[PDB]
Symmetry: C4
Subunit: 29 residues, 4 copies
């Protein structure tokens, strides 16, 4: 359960990094 947490925190950071570099913006452009 501790690892699942670690890993979901990395996932959150990965999802952020992707947000930063957006479906609706990519489409608009």
């Amino acid at each position: 359960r501790m690892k699942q947490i670690e890993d979901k925190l990395e996932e959150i950071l990965s999802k952020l990094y992707h947000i930063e570099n957006x479906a609706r913006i990519k489409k608009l452009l």
Copy 2:
């Protein structure tokens, strides 16, 4: 407290999902 945290991680992942797929840009574009 561990399960509380695990729930918050899931709310955080759902929220990023909603962001991925924005209030002001949806408003801008009529969506």
Copy 3:
């Protein structure tokens, strides 16, 4: 340290909610 973690996770969610409802977008508009 466990509470600091709880609280920083709420903070992250609060920062997300605000992002969702952006400095540069608010300015552009």
Copy 4:
């Protein structure tokens, strides 16, 4: 593992800070 997690929380807060204050919109607007 606890400190690893605490570090990730901080990288996550810094990242949200950078987001708050976007690659494609910065590009759009010349910034």
